[PDB]
């Protein structure tokens, strides 16, 4: 189906027994009433395309995913900056992604790093991908920055932004943003279930970054992560959320102060 649909010429009917406009909705099915079994239409050939509305063209946008700060002070400094990789931090890509239950794709992370007031000095950075189970680096001159059996990218600030391709690395067959269950066994409390809905097969390690130098660098960088989806497959479509997001890794909403799905009108018998 490279185009939308064509309409065949129709005419009028005056006879009993054939009722196409009485599709019962109690059956759970969608009404299959076409134009040709209704008001008299003409012959039109439609050449409008359906290529843009596909999933692969709908999820091939980058969007912002994470913002990582790097203070690099002089007396209360940290040096490194870890950031756990998750996409449920910015409600735009999350709202676009949470209209399905199970997804599977590849990523094209792009890292854009700038300075506080805005400037690009030729300082060399080091982006490190720490998988789950590998030790996290503690310090700007730690032992973990040797990057042996560990992927890393060396790029400067004046260079174009780096861009690496990340495969599908979940231990299960697909991703899922809705896990109605519990990660452990035993007795579960009733007051505060901080373990309910915790997606087990979604953790993907921690992203790290430091500045390659000896002493220090009096600068405050701020890098942004842009993740593009590709080779994506979606299952079990879910309705789109109509409530404002409130938490990072828990779908919640305000019990009072509920937002309606539509705006208000003056009267029901008025279209304006």
């Amino acid at each position: 189906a490279e185009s939308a649909a064509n309409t065949t010429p129709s005419s009028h009917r005056l006879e009993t027994g054939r009722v196409p406009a009485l599709q019962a909705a109690e059956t759970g099915a969608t009404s299959n009433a076409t134009d040709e079994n209704m008001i008299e239409t003409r012959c039109v050939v439609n050449r409008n395309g359906v290529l843009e509305t596909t999933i692969n063209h709908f999820f091939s946008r980058s969007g912002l995913v994470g913002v990582v700060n790097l203070t690099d002070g002089g007396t209360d400094t940290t040096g490194y900056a870890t950031w756990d990789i998750d996409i449920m931090g910015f409600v735009q890509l999350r709202r676009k992604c949470e209209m399905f239950t199970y997804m599977r794709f590849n990523a094209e992370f792009t890292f854009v790093t700038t300075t506080k007031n805005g400037e690009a000095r030729p300082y060399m950075l080091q982006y490190m991908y720490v998988p789950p189970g590998a030790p996290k680096p503690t310090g700007r001159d730690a032992f973990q920055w040797q990057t042996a059996t560990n992927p890393s990218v060396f790029v400067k600030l004046t260079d174009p932004p780096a861009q690496v391709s990340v495969p599908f690395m979940s231990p299960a067959s697909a991703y899922q943003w809705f896990y109605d269950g519990y990660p452990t066994f035993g007795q579960h409390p009733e007051t505060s279930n901080t373990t309910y809905g915790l997606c087990p097969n979604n953790m993907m390690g921690t992203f790290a970054v430091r500045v390659v130098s000896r002493e220090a660098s009096q600068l405050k960088l701020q890098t942004r992560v842009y993740m593009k989806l590709k080779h994506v497959r979606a299952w079990v479509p879910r309705p789109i959320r109509s409530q404002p997001y409130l938490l990072k890794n828990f779908p919640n909403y305000d019990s009072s102060k509920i937002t309606n799905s539509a705006r208000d009108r003056s009267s029901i018998k008025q279209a304006n």
Partner: protein
């Protein structure tokens, strides 16, 4: 020739007089796990009779100020019968389900219900606190209601932040008291893993929400219950060990 039906599974049978056609979820029948998609090595067990039958839950009176109810299907019949006993001893589980919701009334009552399944139906906490120490989370009887069931607080947002109006994308069916008095949905095994524990993870959940209120004149009957039966089609179990409770 279509408003009558007799569903027989095992040693149970469900007869009806006013019914619509059965709803088959996503066009897929429940089938056994193929050897290509499997990942375990131990041979799974298949009782095929004692765990494949219509288990009837309790009935709930549908008043005028009712909001709705929901269940978790690999948790409701998790303590009742051979299915529950077989699911407490094993670690892996895979099955489909056949659904049937009864709600009859006279030809003078009015109202309509919406019965549908929601895969991965995660319950949302209700509150306006963003601190991790006071953020409200649902309890265990709210997440896993058991064989009894749980009620809704804000059924307009499905108690999940998702609007009820768009919930027609799920496999659904209506119970309109002027058209029929029962609704039937057959659902296959929907998961991103071949086998999964039937205790620490509910696959999906049934929901009954009256959108059109129940109305009747003074003098008619006033007890209108909602009865639900569940058939675990094509059950498989693996990883045999000691029996756990929860």
């Amino acid at each position: 020739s279509d408003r009558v039906a007799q569903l027989t599974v095992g040693n149970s049978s469900i007869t009806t007089q006013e019914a619509a056609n059965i709803v088959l979820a996503y066009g897929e029948w429940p089938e056994y796990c193929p050897d290509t998609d499997a990942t375990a090595v131990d041979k799974p067990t298949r009782p095929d009779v004692s765990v494949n039958r219509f288990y009837t839950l309790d009935s709930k009176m549908w008043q005028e100020n009712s909001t709705g109810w929901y269940w978790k299907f690999p948790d409701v019949l998790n303590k009742t019968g051979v299915f529950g006993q077989n699911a407490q001893f094993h670690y892996l589980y895979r099955s489909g389900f056949c659904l049937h919701v009864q709600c009859n009334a006279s030809k003078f009552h009015q109202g309509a219900l919406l019965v549908a399944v929601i895969p991965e139906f995660v319950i949302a906490g209700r509150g306006s606190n963003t601190k991790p120490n006071e953020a409200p989370h649902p309890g265990f009887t709210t997440t896993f209601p058991g064989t009894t069931g749980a009620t809704f607080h804000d059924p307009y947002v499905l108690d999940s932040g998702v609007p009820l109006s768009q919930a027609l994308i799920y496999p659904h069916q209506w119970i309109n008291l002027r058209t029929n008095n029962c609704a039937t949905v057959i659902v296959p095994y929907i998961n991103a893993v071949p086998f999964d524990s039937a205790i620490n993870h509910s696959n999906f959940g049934l929901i009954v929400i009256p959108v059109s209120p129940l109305k009747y004149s003074s003098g008619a009957t006033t007890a209108i219950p909602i009865t639900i039966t569940i058939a675990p089609l094509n059950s498989e179990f693996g990883g045999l060990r000691q029996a756990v409770s929860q």
